[PDB]
Ligand binder design. Structure first.
Ligand SMILES: C[C@@H]1[C@H]([C@H](C(=O)O)[C@@H](C)O)N=C(C(=O)O)[C@H]1S[C@@H]1CN[C@H](C(=O)Nc2cccc(C(=O)O)c2)C1
Ligand SMILES: C[C@@H]1[C@H]([C@H](C(=O)O)[C@@H](C)O)N=C(C(=O)O)[C@H]1S[C@@H]1CN[C@H](C(=O)Nc2cccc(C(=O)O)c2)C1
Ligand SMILES: C[C@@H]1[C@H]([C@H](C(=O)O)[C@@H](C)O)N=C(C(=O)O)[C@H]1S[C@@H]1CN[C@H](C(=O)Nc2cccc(C(=O)O)c2)C1
Ligand SMILES: C[C@@H]1[C@H]([C@H](C(=O)O)[C@@H](C)O)N=C(C(=O)O)[C@H]1S[C@@H]1CN[C@H](C(=O)Nc2cccc(C(=O)O)c2)C1
Ligand SMILES: [Zn+2]
Ligand SMILES: [Zn+2]
Ligand SMILES: [Zn+2]
Ligand SMILES: [Zn+2]
Ligand SMILES: [Zn+2]
Ligand SMILES: [Zn+2]
Ligand SMILES: [Zn+2]
Ligand SMILES: [Zn+2]
Ligand SMILES: [Zn+2]
Ligand SMILES: [Zn+2]
Ligand SMILES: [Zn+2]
Ligand SMILES: [Zn+2]
Lengths: 266, 266, 266, 266
């Protein structure tokens, strides 16, 4: 009669998979992912840090861009994550096998990473990737220091329980630049109200909007560059139109309120 | 010359290890641990639930008390935890091997349980126990239903990041009894202010005092019975002097404020 | 220019995904998977055992067939595996979440299962599935007893390091039937000689042919029924043409020797 | 009445905990553990390798000896293990947190390491330590290359399922020296015959004696130096009386045969 359906691959817009050369954000901070997925390399005298890696198939491209920047596999010391979905943490397991890197994450992100995104609160097993283990668990507001660049974790639960903003201070034209890599604030297809798998979902998003609004934030970056109005293909003007953290949080809250109203009506 | 020190066993007051026969709390709820460590058995037509197990060496005693209650190893379906320290989650791994039980816990408790209490935020590796894996991850306010007894998780971070209160409604003398198993609110030897491993420790405790104060709570129980003024050796009056959740939270907050003042002075 | 390739779903022949009603093998043993993937249910008075589950998307179908047999989710006690590839262990994680079942496996299978088939010795990350944890680790020749049905593990490394044959004795028409569920002995696209990830691959296959040849084996079943000449769609004659364990081992060794010769020539 | 017993710490002879300064074995190989527990540091231009760490409380001493040798925490790249018992893998988790090191191990050792030595086939939970995760799984005969020093794994199951000998070639006085770090071949208090948790124990030991006998072995070292007649406190003559691999294997087999005979008589 009728067989069960074939497994469906997690397919994405081509621009999410379009390689780009490294794009400099500040003196030691570079975008090294694809046109439409952020993966940030921060280079110190004491090794390099990667914040996100994008999709599972991006590992070799990331390593090629690291090499172009002078970062060998032994020089990658630390991987940090915005959240542990397949389009941001996809290549983490492979990167750990191929480099010196260790992963630091909060408990919620660590648990999701260790199950490869399976049993997701909203997606089930629809979007999985190779599992990886965290080497260090961080708490809210904890700092991690690499070569005198201090990264601070700001938990902003909602998009996932373990969603995190990472902040650090780099320099540009001699002057300090407070960089905020704020996680996604979307809720794509989520049941927001009365969700048995996430009962306090709405309260957590509301707190997260407030957290993002208050981040130290001369420059905002986001896992999907379009969410913060970055255009990584625009060269010297890639960041010209970027939102402030305040504007990003307000836009996300307006969208969220509209989604709540539509859910009540549906 | 001088060898490194021998490993130090986690030794406890004898009353924490003193077996007791099952003590009935409500129609389907029993204390089955030791004189000074709580381990609650809730019996349903659809299997039994255990909330905490005490110290690592308590597994056989727990199984003996379960048998006395008519609960065979196959009948134990679920283990819930207040927090994943050795004196409350100690025998979980062994219980999983010897029974049908699966563990449900929040992400923070799951991560700590899976490392057997090692790399504790405050105790380091001083207090470890056999590691165990969680089978289900719960979110704040999520319910788990076993035989029509509905258990609700109320996160109350502080004592550990993953500290949880569990509430359910049983009956006694025909009437509903709202039981609150509230976690520890102590901070034994903790650095409270400016702790790099737990930057928001104070805010989390303060929120947790408020959470405990508001629990549905006709009867309060706690992992250390003395914290809620239970005396499990007092028979028909074991619960007579028990605190309300409001009184427990107020006493814990007063103690916490005193500890903060002493830390500033030290 | 040219984006990175999209992820490729693990797609299989339709017959591997074609549901079938339960097919009785012996008094307490049933095939409950699909036309072309084995999943064996053994029913005891003390709960049920499942040997393999097939593809990830088969979980609900398996539970439906279990219900048809009188096995509720609480009644499934144990899951055993031939090997931890996606087409045999695919739905294990989901089955553990939805039933009482615990997994017993050898260390090699447990490690591969816990990474969801990622970093496979031969397939890399090409064929992954939701990760799961084993609850009990077994050694070669160890027995597991459920309701007086004794299952014996016979390690037969090669297809995977952790490949296992499981044997047990059921009855049929009053008489004992020694059932052998022997794992795959294929090496699909494998580098056999001088493989740096599996240096003793050839010796292990040769030992495994000998192990299979000697199993107690009135009835042979295999994860892919065609490998043992079963036809699960043939009804009362589904097993009529089945190979002996001796014939299965000889055919596998002949094929393996041909593959070695072709590898030397390529 | 009578409380349950207190947990018993894993206590050892003082010499196992007696720190020593680094002792040179060959041009790039040093003993850096204690008088009576081996922990080998191999120094390359491309980072350092540690084979075993001894007891849990040895981590800081190991790091101090690494510093004395010019190896900073970032320079430690790889940890290899003989077997995953507390007196050899004890400080692995802590070393991973404090250095750049990643662990490579076979599946059996990885599973035991990840449960911190709990549920041991012979010791139960009597001898546990902080759990750690392996970063790479190795197969029998696989090589790992660090700075042109090639380490080969030779599985020698028995003492634990995952027991491994590691071999490599260093130099001394200009000439190549084939170093064999062979695991323990003891069976302390083990049930050897008919052990349900290890049915093929005897066959595995017998194969392991043969494996050790045949290792490339100009210099033999063992996790307990006394097993190979090393005296790490004897300075320039520490290795003078060391056994060959052939002599070590023969002595272990003679002892094993005596233990079998005594078990039959008991
Ligand atoms: C579903 C996405 C995907 C998944 C995840 O991570 O959850 C992942 C598992 O696949 N990652 C997401 C995230 O926030 O990280 C979500 S959100 C994504 C970003 N941006 C797209 C978009 O919908 N753009 C749009 C459409 C119409 C008008 C306008 C305008 O210009 O106003 C913009 C969609
Ligand atoms: C250190 C304890 C131990 C550890 C843990 O879990 O962290 C575990 C790892 O060991 N579990 C604790 C917890 O809260 O769960 C802490 S707190 C414990 C309970 N009650 C004791 C107590 O100090 N009593 C006392 C003393 C003087 C006067 C009075 C009075 O009557 O006012 C009372 C101490
Ligand atoms: C690649 C398969 C798949 C993977 C795995 O598990 O490794 C999984 C990850 O996808 N599972 C396999 C296994 O042995 O478990 C391998 S082998 C499969 C069975 N049977 C097919 C077959 O090739 N049949 C054939 C063709 C021509 C003539 C004749 C004849 O009649 O002689 C038969 C192929
Ligand atoms: C129990 C030990 C301990 C445990 C382990 O790892 O399993 C660990 C968990 O604690 N590690 C061991 C191992 O082989 O790795 C075993 S064996 C240890 C070495 N050497 C001692 C010895 O008994 N010596 C002796 C006595 C009398 C005469 C003579 C003579 O000179 O002939 C020698 C004992
Ligand atoms: Zn600079
Ligand atoms: Zn996402
Ligand atoms: Zn995304
Ligand atoms: Zn009742
Ligand atoms: Zn505690
Ligand atoms: Zn306690
Ligand atoms: Zn019958
Ligand atoms: Zn396979
Ligand atoms: Zn297959
Ligand atoms: Zn040299
Ligand atoms: Zn040992
Ligand atoms: Zn030892």
């Amino acid at each position: 009669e009728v067989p069960l359906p074939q497994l469906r691959a997690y397919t994405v817009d081509a621009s999410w998979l379009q390689p780009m050369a490294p794009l400099q954000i500040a003196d030691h901070t570079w975008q090294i992912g694809t046109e439409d997925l952020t993966a940030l390399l921060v280079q110190t005298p004491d090794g390099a840090v990667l914040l996100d890696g994008g999709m599972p198939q991006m590992a070799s491209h990331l390593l090629d861009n690291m090499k172009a920047r002078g970062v060998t596999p032994r020089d990658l010391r630390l991987i940090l994550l915005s959240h542990a979905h397949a389009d941001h943490a996809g290549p983490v397991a492979e990167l750990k096998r191929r480099t010196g890197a260790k992963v630091a994450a909060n408990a919620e992100s660590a648990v999701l990473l260790a199950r490869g995104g399976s049993d997701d609160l909203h997606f089930g097993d629809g979007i999985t990737y190779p599992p990886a283990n965290a080497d260090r668990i961080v708490m809210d507001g904890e700092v991690i220091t690499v070569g005198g660049i201090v990264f601070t974790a700001h938990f902003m639960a909602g998009h996932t329980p373990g969603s995190t903003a990472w902040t650090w201070t780099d320099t540009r034209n001699g002057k300090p630049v407070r960089i905020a890599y704020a996680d996604s604030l979307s809720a794509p297809g989520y049941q927001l109200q009365g969700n048995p798998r996430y009962p306090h979902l709405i309260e957590d998003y509301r707190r997260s909007f407030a957290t993002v609004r208050a981040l130290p934030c001369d420059v905002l970056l986001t896992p999907h560059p379009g969410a913060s109005n970055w255009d990584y293909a625009a060269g010297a003007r890639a960041g010209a139109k970027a939102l402030t953290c305040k504007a990003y949080a307000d836009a996300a809250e307006q969208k969220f309120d509209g989604q709540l109203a539509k859910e009540t009506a549906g």
